[PDB]
Every structure is written in structure tokens, then in C-alpha cells.
Amino acid sequence: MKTVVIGAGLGGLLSAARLSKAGHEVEVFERLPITGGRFTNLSYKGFQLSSGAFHMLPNGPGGPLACFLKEVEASVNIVRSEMTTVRVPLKKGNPDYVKGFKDISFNDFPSLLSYKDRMKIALLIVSTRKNRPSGSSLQAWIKSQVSDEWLIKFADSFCGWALSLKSDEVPVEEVFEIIENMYRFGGTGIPEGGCKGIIDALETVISANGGKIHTGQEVSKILIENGKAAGIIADDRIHDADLVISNLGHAATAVLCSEALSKEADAAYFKMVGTLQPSAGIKICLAADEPLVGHTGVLLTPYTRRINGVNEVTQADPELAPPGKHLTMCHQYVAPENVKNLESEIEMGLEDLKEIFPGKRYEVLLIQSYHDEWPVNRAASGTDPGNETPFSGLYVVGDGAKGKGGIEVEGVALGVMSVMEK
Numbered sequence: 001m002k003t004v005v006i007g008a009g010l011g012g013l014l015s016a017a018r019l020s021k022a023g024h025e026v027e028v029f030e031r032l033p034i035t036g037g038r039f040t041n042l043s044y045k046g047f048q049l050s051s052g053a054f055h056m057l058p059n060g061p062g063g064p065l066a067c068f069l070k071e072v073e074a075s076v077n078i079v080r081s082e083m084t085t086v087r088v089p090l091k092k093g094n095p096d097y098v099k100g101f102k103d104i105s106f107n108d109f110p111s112l113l114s115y116k117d118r119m120k121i122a123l124l125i126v127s128t129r130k131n132r133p134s135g136s137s138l139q140a141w142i143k144s145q146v147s148d149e150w151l152i153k154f155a156d157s158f159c160g161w162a163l164s165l166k167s168d169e170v171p172v173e174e175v176f177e178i179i180e181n182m183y184r185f186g187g188t189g190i191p192e193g194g195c196k197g198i199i200d201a202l203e204t205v206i207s208a209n210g211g212k213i214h215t216g217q218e219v220s221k222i223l224i225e226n227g228k229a230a231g232i233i234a235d236d237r238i239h240d241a242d243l244v245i246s247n248l249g250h251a252a253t254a255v256l257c258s259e260a261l262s263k264e265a266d267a268a269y270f271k272m273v274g275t276l277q278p279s280a281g282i283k284i285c286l287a288a289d290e291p292l293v294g295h296t297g298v299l300l301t302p303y304t305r306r307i308n309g310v311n312e313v314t315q316a317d318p319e320l321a322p323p324g325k326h327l328t329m330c331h332q333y334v335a336p337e338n339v340k341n342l343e344s345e346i347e348m349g350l351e352d353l354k355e356i357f358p359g360k361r362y363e364v365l366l367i368q369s370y371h372d373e374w375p376v377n378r379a380a381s382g383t384d385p386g387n388e389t390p391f392s393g394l395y396v397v398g399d400g401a402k403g404k405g406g407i408e409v410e411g412v413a414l415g416v417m418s419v420m421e422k
């Protein structure tokens with residue numbers, strides 16, 4: 001078939017790589033000067049920062065993304081991270097890190113509970129695998145099981161870092177599917193070259209399979225003929241297609257289909273699009289003169305105003321920073337109501353840094369905020385719709401149409417796989 005992909009984000013490039021290998025003519029149209037969307041590198045003062053993602057795969061070398069890459073014969077080294085750690089107050093009862101802190105391994109989170117509560121968690125670790133909690137938020141479920149506030153702080157940190165959500169905003173069943181994927185695929189990892197390593201590898205496969213990628217080209221319309229995708233208009237030129245893959249998310253895709261959509265015949269689709277809620281966050285990048293995390297995993301920070309966790313990917317790939325420097329990146333969840341208040345949100349994160357990393361030698365390199373049309377995810381984890389649209393031959397991929405239960409790009413990969421199978 002003749003196929004076109006709108007947008008060179010990770011979803012679009014995964015699609016292009018698989019479709020070209022599958023024997024289809026593929027052209028990708030990307031509006032920006034470079035490919036990769038929110039998953040590529042940004043050269044900044046000698047550092048390889050990113051356009052979004054923290055240079056990390058949620059399931060490292062074992063998950064749906066890593067698997068997709070092997071399936072299309074993309075070549076890129078993904079290293080498995082060391083176990084994630086968690087920063088907690090020195091004494092139970094301390095509300096923050098002011099009086100000092102200690103670090104525990106992620107898997108030892110129950111160690112801070114009473115014996116009674118620890119044993120309850122041990123049994124739930126067994127029972128929940130096949131008897132999955134459902135029908136409430138994670139926070140509500142935890143509270144029904146254990147009263148110790150530690151688990152809520154820990155859950156909020158995990159949910160903030162991994163999903164850019166609060167634990168009272170994610171369905172418990174989604175969290176248990178995510179947990180099942182940890183067992184299936186393993187922990188985090190870091191691609192050599194950062195995000196761009198993966199982007200470059202996919203571009204190589206696309207090129208080797210006769211696909212073409214066009215940057216600096218904005219798609220302005222999806223052509224529909226008799227309820228069927230028929231092509232696109234990009235930079236005022238018509239391109240025919242039997243298949244259109246949109247990497248823009250449903251909302252933006254709907255706008256491109258505006259002339260063909262019916263508020264009557266497509267009422268369910270309009271309603272769906274109107275419910276989509278993106279997630280928001282702020283990333284603080286530090287130019288560190290010494291290690292702050294000290295390993296290749298995540299440091300979760302549950303006892304802060306805003307910061308949920310931090311990583312240090314130069315532990316895995318030193319080429320992402322100048323000699324004698326580390327790149328340490330922090331994430332904080334931003335609630336939709338506070339997007340209008342980004343300045344004060346940032347201030348709070350900056351205060352957190354002093355308590356997380358007291359007396360350490362670093363400078364704030366860049367602060368980047370994400371929300372709305374360039375968000376953390378186009379659809380909040382646990383809420384993704386499918387990849388289909390009212391029109392045959394038109395599919396949506398990307399983090400506005402993630403496979404259920406995949407964290408971040410693992411979800412993006414699952415979604416692309418679903419479309420490909422269809």
C-alpha cells in the first residue's frame with residue numbers, strides 16, 4: 001500500500017519502520033526541523049538534554065519498545081538500570097528531609113511499615129496478581145488496605161514520576177496492570193545516545209526499507225473520500241494514501257478531519273475527543289559537578305512539595321554531558337488547575353532541590369514545562385481511547401492512544417503494535 005504518517009514522533013517512526021519493513025511505501029511528514037517529537041535530544045550548553053522524555057525506557061531492554069526495536073531490526077544498546085531507590089526522612093514522623101534522610105531500595109518499600117502491615121503487603125503481593133483490585137483510585141484502594149500514610153506518599157511519588165498523575169487520579173486496576181508488566185518485562189533502562197539513539201536507529205530502518213521522511217512540512221488536512229482515508233495535504237501539496245497513520249493524538253487528528261466529521265453520525269467520537277485530558281509536568285535539568293543520584297535508576301522523592309523523582313542518565317552514558325559533569329533531571333507532576341500557576345510551581349520545585357540535595361554542587365541548567373498541546377501525555381494514563389477513528393484506513397498512534405497498562409513509551413509501543421496487527 002501507499003501509506004503516510006503524520007508526525008515523526010516515536011509512535012510515527014515506530015509505525016513507519018514496521019510498515020516499510022512490511023513492504024509498504026511510506027512517507028512521513030514532520031512539521032519541525034527535526035524528527036523525534038517529545039522523544040529526542042536537545043543540545044544545550046554541552047549537554048544532551050531532551051525534547052521531553054528523561055532518556056529512559058520504563059521497561060528498559062525487556063519491554064514492548066525494546067521488543068519492537070528488535071522486531072524491525074533496529075540497532076541500539078539499551079542498558080538495564082540499577083534498582084530504583086527512594087529517599088525518605090531519617091525518622092518516621094518527620095514530614096520532610098530537613099532533619100536528614102536515608103535511601104531504601106524500591107522493592108523494600110514495605111520495610112518502613114509495621115510488621116503487621118509488611119506481612120499484609122507480602123500477601124497482597126501474591127493475591128493481587130490474579131485477583132486484581134478494581135473500581136477505585138489507587139489511593140482509595142491503598143487506604144482500604146493499610147492506614148500508614150507512607151504508602152500514600154510512596155504511591156504519589158511513583159504515580160507522579162511514572163505517569164505524571166496523583167494516586168487519587170489513576171484507576172487501581174491500571175496500576176496493577178503496570179505492576180504485572182514489571183514482572184513480565186523488568187525495570188527501567190537507558191538507551192545509548194539517549195532518546196535520540198532510538199530515533200536514529202528507527203530512521204536507519206526506515207531508510208533501509210525505502211521509506212522517506214520529510215521535515216519542515218506541516219500536514220493541514222486529512223483527505224477523506226466516502227468515509228475512507230484517501231490521503232493528506234502537506235505544505236499545500238496533495239499526497240495520496242491507502243493508509244494514514246496520525247501521530248498527533250485524536251484531538252489534533254479530529255481537527256485535520258474537520259470537513260468530513262459529522263456531529264450527528266460521529267457523535268460518539270466527538271464526545272470521546274471532548275473527554276481527552278492531557279497530563280502536565282515540569283522538568284528541571286541540573287548541571288551537576290558531582291553525582292547526585294549516583295546510579296542508573298530513578299531516585300523517588302516522596303517527601304517534597306512537588307518533585308516526584310530524579311534520574312542521572314550520565315551514570316549510564318557519560319557522553320550526554322561535558323567531562324566532569326553529570327546530567328541530573330527532576331520531574332514534578334502539575335495538576336491541571338495549576339498550569340496557570342507555573343511560576344509558583346517552579347518555585348516550589350526549586351525549594352525542594354535544596355532539601356533533596358543539601359550542600360551539593362550543581363547549577364540549574366534549564367527548566368522545561370509541558371502541558372496542553374505539548375504535554376507529558378496527550379491522554380492521561382489509564383484513560384486512553386483506542387487507535388481507531390470514524391474513517392477506514394485512518395489510525396491514531398502515540399501517547400494519546402497508548403496500549404492499556406504500558407507506562408509512557410511502552411504504552412506508545414503497545415498501541416502501535418495494535419494498529420499494525422489490525
Ligand SMILES: Cc1cc2nc3c(=O)[nH]c(=O)nc-3n(C[C@H](O)[C@H](O)[C@H](O)COP(=O)(O)OP(=O)(O)OC[C@H]3O[C@@H](n4cnc5c(N)ncnc54)[C@H](O)[C@@H]3O)c2cc1C
Pocket residue numbers: 006007008009010011012029030031032035036037038039052053054055056057058217218219220247248281282283370374375376377397398399400407408409410412
Ligand atoms: C517532561 C516529560 C518527560 C518524559 N519522560 C519520559 C520517560 O522518561 N520515559 C518515557 O517512556 N516517556 C517519557 N515521556 C513521554 C514521552 O516523551 C512521550 O510519550 C512520547 O515522546 C510521545 O510520542 P508520540 O508518539 O505521542 O509523538 P509526539 O512526541 O507527540 O510527536 C508528534 C509529532 O507530530 C508533529 N506534528 C504535530 N502536528 C503536525 C502536523 N500538523 N504536521 C506534521 N507534523 C506534526 C510534532 O512536531 C511531533 O514531532 C516524557 C514526557 C514528558 C513531557
